[PDB]
Symmetry: C4
Subunit: 30 residues, 4 copies
């Protein structure tokens, strides 16, 4: 359950990261 | 294998992040 | 717990990626 | 060993990603 909690935690950061990069790509295209 | 399954899903996110970075590096003319 | 240990190391990388994105978003004046 | 191999694989992508972002930050600062 530690390994499963770390797993989710990792995913949720990755969603945050992919959103920051989408925001960068959007800016740069404007 | 829930954990195996998570591994794969995490990696998938990483590929997609790599696609975003390729888009970004093109916009920055590098 | 080698796998637990890996989890933590992965997360650490994600934080650092987040620091880089904060630096990048400042350089892009966003 | 599948979980341990996925672990390494994830790390190695993250190193690639942190390098792409360092290259972005360097460019933008030049």
């Amino acid at each position: 359950k530690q390994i499963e909690d770390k797993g989710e935690e990792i995913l949720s950061k990755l969603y945050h990261i992919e959103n920051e990069l989408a925001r960068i790509k959007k800016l740069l295209g404007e």
